[PDB]
């Protein structure tokens, strides 16, 4: 059972700066953490990160075609991209929107998400653990 | 450690009505589910519900005095109540805001929350499992 | 059958003074019960300044599949809790306002109930409640 | 005592389309039903319908000049006509604004009315019976 | 010469938290300072606090029936409660809206009050002394 | 301590037209209450924004507190706000009328977010209530 | 030459019911005044009034083809008619918008005009004499 | 098949007193061009224009009863008429909204249409050829 | 009877720039025109210009104490000054707001006036002749 | 004459979902249809699709350099990209914006386009036929 | 070649109250810096400050008549003054708007400028060096 | 001492067409001017341009990891890109935002920038010299 975990722009640099806002973990540490939690639940997690909106669209496309669930932290494109929203709306399996930081306690523009209205559900502010709680929801649904 | 799970107006009726929106589980079964998960996790779950703002405020106050964390589904008061937000901001232990339904796929006025800017984090649209995921985050701190 | 008339905060002091007419709350319960007997209905007329109490009355009506005529006072404009309790009614809900809320302060022009109500009557004074009965008498 | 019942554009076709929104009663049938209820109340009803704003303005002018009350379902002109509002503000007898459908459960632009601030009262969402109820109000003054 | 001083939700806990916004004086201390100033001024002050909306309305109804002035710090109901405003609008004697904190220098939502337009006057930002100044006004009036 | 009471535009004509207290009368009341509180009140009025700014600059330099009724400039003047922001002693914004029961435009104030506190609609006594707060620090 | 004076809906009832929001002068009396004042200025005024938008459009069309000035009191259509603003935008000669009452001292919706951005100029609040002054502007070109 | 092409206010004046914002083609030349295209397409076009909203409504009621498609350029009433929108919402055959000018390159208010949300589709800015393209859509369905 | 004509900031420089729609007339030539016309009417005009807000307020205070009328072109302050509005709001005689240019055909910020709602009337876009029309109005009251 | 038909993100997947919203025609079959209609018209169509914004900008830069027309369905970038609008605004030949779906009958965010104000004109809701009607306008200019 | 540097209200107090904003340089010191840099560049700088709007207007009127450029830091009047804006629009030589602090990083009202749309360009946030950069642009014309 | 100058989409085509907006200088020429003034100043300028947001993000990451300053003309992404803003907010060295044209003099959407609030300073409207002025600020830190 495959679960795609997809990270958007700038998330490749997790841990290098403001560990107050996004955690101390780097992206390789995140990938290993998610893979371990996913094996413990009976799932396989494919974890991918890209700064390129076209590349993220490609991965969502493949997820739609294989009818696989998506855990998406779209970074900045969360608030700006209709193209990514429409590609995510093709997913027949669940879609969990994840934000490491509490986007409601930050700038006003971070409060609006193209993704939330079409997601199965949203987890915000729970730090890197939010990804792990999303997998666990997909294990039980 | 004690975790408080507080439910706001109307959630006493959980399970009888709009089962595609809220669960099929009743509040009684909900309380049981939470307690069992909390037990597994090394925690103790104190799960209470009320339709009165004054009573919710009283329980939040108690949690603040006790330095205990709160998992709050405020129901309609989420969107309307400054008095509740202000009492919640007194918590020193974590506050997770939970909604059973995906408040972002619903009427616009449900997209606005007084609680979210002052919560540690927010979990929405993951049905009743959002409560159990919130327990799991607090297990980790 | 039974029709529930539910009045919200401040409405206990009807006709008292210190817009809404000179009829008191006692006199209105009597009016509604007279008119409803005449229509062949049983009217239960209840008032509470407590939101939680209003909800419990709504919940009861919804369990018994009975109609509600609701003047929710200030909470018309402010309570999502109450809207959601009323959205559970399977029998009709008629939202009533004694005053013409459209001829007053701008904030009184927004109701959380109207979108989920069967219909709404506004500005016709106390008779508003009687017209709602007459509507419910025809179903 | 004459009461003037006035219907705006498109309502000549009542009963024929959107019966789920505007009822299955035709406009001839409405006129009869209203005339009957008026007589039972001790009133005489003059029911008229035009798709023409100039026409509806004329009939309002006559009602103002005879000091007769008006029951008005102005149809789409509810939302758009300042001219109709002003003609109506001249009236010294009462003005009751009626809508068949519940205009607050429908498109956002139907929630705004130039007539409501200047009317004695408003009835909405009670079907055709909404006209009978306004007649009952007027018999009582 | 009776003055009612009425405190709304959360204010039973004054001085216990956020002492930089609301002060270090407790509610019981505040009762005593208000009582002492009211005596100096030739007034009898009745100081009451509640978390319950319905209870505040009853207190205001009694002030209405006895033509007594009210000094009101409605706390969070300031910005949300029309029922509270309506009850206050029946007062024939002066009404003083008081806030301890400078509500204009805090969150945007605290900058709107249902009470101010119908109050005699408003004092904000002058701490606990705001209530004492409102007493002095009423002794003058 | 010296406390500066500053009145903005049009306030020189108080008492003419609707309280009945004139500006001379107002100065006199303020000075009395100030002395009863152990303070020396300096009360000035100007229709000129530049002059108002100068008075505020001087209170900042002398670390004195200001009671300010800015009149119509309350709702309009960023330059006045910034001058007041420089004050290290408390600033109290006072309005004679209840600005919240009037036109919408009067419900916005450039001064309130930077003031220590605001007193509105208590008439001329607001100036004396603001004196009393200042006397207590 | 010829100057067109066009009044829109409700304005044929000037004088009766009414003001003075709009004066005590009647529409016949207004016609006489304008004609007289126009005579004195060496102009011929043609004064016409209609509650029909299509009829007012027709009169503007005639003025556009005759290359004649227009003094326009559009009534409620001032605030609502794009079609009237488009007819008037065709005029090559001057267009003077006139309102009897001071539209800026009334309801907010009257403060908005489709005609003002395309008019040569606007006169508001000077009563009926408003028309006579526009004539005198037209006499000077 | 019969197709109705209905032009609303001021469009009788195509080509006379203004543009190209609108082309140099007169209404009669547009009628001839539309009839030639229709015939080439195997259809019969009926082209009607009015400055009167009531007349437009009558024509729309007829097309609805005749189950005939409509190409509508409602002119200024596009932006203003709820009554025209509702008459159009009843058409069972396609409705194509056409504007000669590019309404999106003009005033802000031209950018809102009551008709677009209930139209099959919309063509704007393509000049008079827009009508001939709408016809061609209808010949293919 | 004395009439005050008061021009605000930058107006001293009339006819230096840019001749539509401020005109080619200088401030000196405008004083002379206003004076002749005032005499023709049986009135005395006192025409004054200043770039100082305080100076304007003083001139307004004089007219208020002398129960004299004012024709005011506040220039930029029309849009920005509550002080100037409050000063004019004291005038017991008529106040006419004048603008040389059609402020409705210009920047959106020029369509808001603090003066218009308290003025007797308003004249816009009729050039320097606006001031003479204003005098004419005052001659008749 | 080369015409460029450019499709944006997700549109390579046409025909796979929401047929319904976008039709059953695949991208391959669309290219063939547009090629064949172009030939009928004496044009040569070059039909390209990409998920990459950078790639779209290069294709529009080439059309700007070669002075060739563009039919552009920008998909989600329609409502979000200034960069795309600016590159389009450089086009010297006609630019026709196409949407397969009726974007005004869908979410509010879809009713805003960066492209429309600088397009020659806009065709929406006519299905894939919209691309062929756009070719036909270009054949005439 | 003369260059007017004009400083608006409160800027006389530079240096002695907000090093973080604003900076440590006094007005006298800024004068000497600017004159020095200007000499380096072959310009003569005239640097002037006033808290009086009438005074600033007069200096802008003078630079207008002498066709000299202006570096303007209007302080608070930037956000509030139409009069200042209009005087500035008369300059034929370049007008450089300067702000010492980054006004986009501050309260939302400092983000609106009446001067930006009419300036040649604008420099913000580069501290006092902003004045010296503007001179360098003017030295290049 | 390295300074990176980074240009966004369409800016490769500088100088070619639109020279009254963006100058007649081409990109190659810009790079030569920038490198020459950086030498003059004791600095090394690395000047790059890309139409790809992913590439831009990578350039900004490398500047963050090297603690180098950035002068950024983001082009259209200025107004639209949160992902860009976030990458820029990692920069420990100064960030200068530069726009060639005066964005406040253009369309309203150009007056909003995601970069301004997190930049050190912003230069707009000063043409190509804007970049050289930003180089000079940075020389002086
Ligand atoms: O996971 C984060 O909280 C986020 O999604 C990442 C980068 C920012 O652009 C988002 O707004 C928040
Ligand atoms: O958990 C639910 O999704 C909710 O919190 C409950 C009741 C409603 O009032 C809230 O909007 C959503
Ligand atoms: O009965 C009505 O007029 C009302 O519901 C009663 C009290 C007020 O709070 C409502 O706005 C109106
Ligand atoms: O009868 C009413 O429901 C209505 O007035 C009739 C026609 C529509 O235009 C209104 O919005 C509702
Ligand atoms: O007195 C106080 O400042 C307040 O009234 C009390 C609690 C908060 O909820 C109000 O916003 C401010
Ligand atoms: O003191 C008064 O209430 C006020 O400050 C004076 C003049 C007006 O401009 C203010 O809005 C209120
Ligand atoms: O004459 C004017 O006052 C007006 O044009 C006439 C009738 C109303 O509908 C307008 O708002 C004002
Ligand atoms: O044909 C069009 O350009 C239009 O429909 C005609 C007249 C105007 O009122 C519309 O805004 C555009
Ligand atoms: O005469 C008028 O056009 C105006 O009063 C004069 C100067 C400008 O500042 C106003 O906006 C209009
Ligand atoms: O062709 C369509 O209708 C559209 O251009 C394509 C995809 C969506 O992102 C647009 O909103 C509509
Ligand atoms: O130069 C400064 O940044 C400013 O111009 C000075 C004073 C404040 O009023 C401005 O907002 C910014
Ligand atoms: O440098 C220019 O002024 C700009 O940064 C470049 C391209 C456009 O998209 C921006 O709005 C302005």
Note the resolution in Å, 1 decimal.
2.0
Is the Cβ atom of D85 under 6 angstroms away from ligand 4? no
DSSP letters spanning C46-112: EE-S-HHHHHHHHHHHHHTT--EEEE-GGGGGT-HHHHHHHTT-SS-EEEEESS-GGGS-GGGG--S
Q: Could you give the CA distance from residue E84 to residue E70 in angstroms, rounded to a whole number?
A: 13
Touch between G and B (at least 3 CB pairs under 8 Å): no
Q: How many domains does chain B have?
A: 1
Q: Could you give the CA distance from residue D85 to residue C121 in angstroms, rounded to a whole number?
A: 20
What chains are in contact with B, requiring at least 3 Cβ pairs below 8 Å?
A, C, E
> CB of H60 within 8 A of CB of H84?
yes
Among residues B76, B9, B81, B84, the alpha carbon closest in space to that of E10 is found at B84
Nearest CA in chain J to H105: J117
Q: Could you give the CA distance from residue B93 to residue J50 in angstroms, rounded to a whole number?
A: 49
Is the Cβ atom of D99 under 6 angstroms away from ligand 4? yes
Q: Sort J42 into a burial class: Cβ within 10 Å, 0-12 / 13-18 / 19+.
A: exposed
What chains are in contact with C, requiring at least 3 Cβ pairs below 8 Å?
B, D, E
Among residues H123, H113, H9, J103, the alpha carbon closest in space to that of H135 is found at H123
DSSP letters spanning L85-137: HHHHHT-SS-EEEEESS-GGGS-GGGG--SSGGGSSEEEESSTTHHHHHHHHH
Spatial strand order of the sheet with A121-124 comes to A44-49, A2-7, A70-73, A95-99, A121-124, B121-124, B95-99, B70-73, B2-7, B44-49
Q: Cα dihedral angle (J46, J51, J54, J59), rounded to 10 degrees?
A: 0
Q: Cα dihedral angle (C128, C129, C131, C133), rounded to 10 degrees?
A: 170
- The sign of the torsion formed by the CA atoms of B39, B43, B46, B47 equals negative
Q: Which residue precedes each gap in chain L (C to N above 2.5 Å)? A: none
Among residues K4, A65, C117, E56, the alpha carbon closest in space to that of D123 is found at C117
**Alpha-carbon distance values, H96 to H78, H79, H119, J22, J124 (Å):** 13, 16, 6, 18, 10
Instruction: Using the CB atoms, write b or e for H22-49: b if 16+ within 10 Å.
Output: bbebebeebbebbbebbeebebebbbeb
User: Whose CA is closest to atom 3 on ligand 6?
Assistant: F97
Q: Could you give the CA distance from residue I73 to residue I88 in angstroms, rounded to a whole number?
A: 12
Q: Sort K64 into a burial class: Cβ within 10 Å, 0-12 / 13-18 / 19+.
A: buried
Interchain CB contact of K61 with I (< 8 Å): yes
> CB of K126 within 8 A of CB of K21?
no
- Residues 31-60 of chain L with CB under 8 A from chain A are 52-54, 57-58
CATH number at residue I114: 3.40.50.9100
> Which positions ≥6 away from C125 have C-beta within 8 Å?
C20, C21, C98
User: Which of L17, L72, L78, L123 has the most ligand 12 atoms within 8 A of CB, as the residue to mutate?
Assistant: L78
Interface test with H, best of G70, G76, G83, G113 (most H CBs within 10 A): G83
Q: Could you give the CA distance from residue F84 to residue A20 in angstroms, rounded to a whole number?
A: 35
DSSP letters spanning A51-109: S-HHHHHHHHHHHHHTT--EEEE-GGGGGT-HHHHHHHTT-SS-EEEEESS-GGGS-GG
Peptide bond preceding I21 in cis form (omega within 30 of 0): yes
Backbone angles phi, psi at D116, to 5 degrees: -50, -45
* Alpha carbon of G120: minimum distance to chain D alpha carbons (Å): 24
In sequence order, the β-bridge partners of residue G15 are none
* Helix (H/G/I), strand (E/B), else coil: G21: coil
Q: Could you give the CA distance from residue G141 to residue I127 in angstroms, rounded to a whole number?
A: 11
Query: Locate tokens 């300073």: which residue?
Result: L121
Among the partner-chain residues I10, I53, I110, the one whose CB lies closest to the CB of K87 is I10
Q: Could you give the CA distance from residue I82 to residue I114 in angstroms, rounded to a whole number?
A: 7
Between chains, do H125 and J122 touch, taking CB under 8 Å as contact?
yes
- Closest ligand 3 atom to C96 CA: 1
Q: Could you give the CA distance from residue K97 to residue K115 in angstroms, rounded to a whole number?
A: 7
A110 is in an annotated binding site: yes
> CB of L104 within 8 A of CB of K117?
yes
> CB of L10 within 8 A of CB of J57?
yes
C25 is in an annotated binding site: no
Query: Locate tokens 């018209």: which residue?
Result: J41
Q: Could you give the CA distance from residue K31 to residue K48 in angstroms, rounded to a whole number?
A: 9
- Residues 99-118 of chain G with CB under 8 A from chain I are 102, 104-105, 113, 116-118
- CA–centroid distance, residue K99 to ligand 11 (Å): 5
Q: Could you give the CA distance from residue E9 to residue E76 in angstroms, rounded to a whole number?
A: 7
Q: Which helix (H) or strand (E) holds F132?
A: helix F125-135
Q: Cα dihedral angle (B22, B23, B25, B30), rounded to 10 degrees?
A: -70
Interface test with A, best of L66, L78, L82 (most A CBs within 10 A): L82
> CB of H92 within 8 A of CB of H38?
no
Written as six digits, the tokens of I129 are 């002749």
Widest CA span in chain C: 39
Q: With contacts defined as CB-CB under 8 Å, which chain K residues touch L123?
A: 121-124, 126, 133
Backbone angles phi, psi at F98, to 5 degrees: -80, 85
Residues, chain J, total?
A: 141
Domain span including residue L68:
1-141
L102 is in an annotated binding site: no
Residue D100 Ramachandran class (φ > 0 left, ψ -120 to 50 alpha, else beta): alpha
> CB of J73 within 8 A of CB of J30?
no
Among the partner-chain residues E61, E83, E92, the one whose CB lies closest to the CB of C74 is E83
Written as six digits, the tokens of L47 are 């000047």
> Which positions ≥6 away from C8 have C-beta within 8 Å?
C47, C48, C49, C54, C70, C71, C72, C73, C74, C75, C76, E83
> Which positions ≥6 away from E54 have C-beta within 8 Å?
C9, C48, C49, C50, C51, C53
Between chains, do G104 and I96 touch, taking CB under 8 Å as contact?
no
Q: Could you give the CA distance from residue E95 to residue E89 in angstroms, rounded to a whole number?
A: 9
**Alpha-carbon distance values, L101 to J10, K71, L20, L104 (Å):** 34, 18, 9, 9
Radius of gyration from C-alpha coordinates of chain K: 14
Contacts by residues G67-70 (CB-CB < 8 Å, ≥ 24 positions apart): G67/G92, G67/G93, G68/G1, G68/G2, G68/G3, G68/G4, G68/G93, G69/G1, G69/G3, G69/G4, G69/G93, G69/G94, G69/G95, G69/G96, G69/G138, G70/G3, G70/G4, G70/G5, G70/G6, G70/G94, G70/G95, G70/G96
What single-letter DSSP state applies at residue D2? E
> Which positions ≥6 away from F93 have C-beta within 8 Å?
F68, F69, F70, F74, F109, F111, F112, F115, F117, F118, F119
Query: How far apart are the two ends of chain D, measured CA to CA in Å?
Result: 11
Written as six digits, the tokens of C83 are 């809207």
K22 part of the active site:
yes
Q: Could you give the CA distance from residue K90 to residue K92 in angstroms, rounded to a whole number?
A: 6
Alpha helices in chain B (DSSP H): 27-40, 53-66, 77-80, 82-89, 129-140
- CA–centroid distance, residue C84 to ligand 3 (Å): 19
CA C13 remoteness from chain centre: 15
> Which positions ≥6 away from D75 have C-beta within 8 Å?
D7, D8, D9, D10, D11, H83, H86
Written as six digits, the tokens of J54 are 């950078």
**Alpha-carbon distance values, I2 to G133, I5, I62, I84, K61 (Å):** 21, 10, 12, 21, 32
Written as six digits, the tokens of F8 are 């903005």
């Amino acid at each position: 059972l495959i679960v795609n975990v997809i990270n958007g722009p700038n998330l490749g640099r997790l841990g290098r700066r403001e560990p107050a806002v996004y955690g101390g973990t780097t992206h390789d540490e995140l990938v290993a953490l998610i893979e371990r939690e996913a094996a413990e639940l009976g799932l396989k997690a494919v974890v991918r990160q890209s700064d390129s909106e076209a590349q993220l669209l490609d991965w969502i496309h493949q997820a739609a075609d294989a009818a696989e669930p998506v855990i998406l932290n779209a970074g900045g494109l969360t608030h700006t991209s209709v193209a990514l929203r429409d590609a995510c709306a093709e997913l027949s399996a669940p879609l969990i929107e994840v934000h490491i930081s509490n986007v409601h306690a930050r700038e006003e523009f971070r409060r609006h998400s193209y993704l939330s209205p079409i997601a199965t559900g949203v987890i915000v502010g729970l730090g890197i653990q939010g990804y792990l709680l999303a997998l666990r929801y997909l294990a039980e649904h």
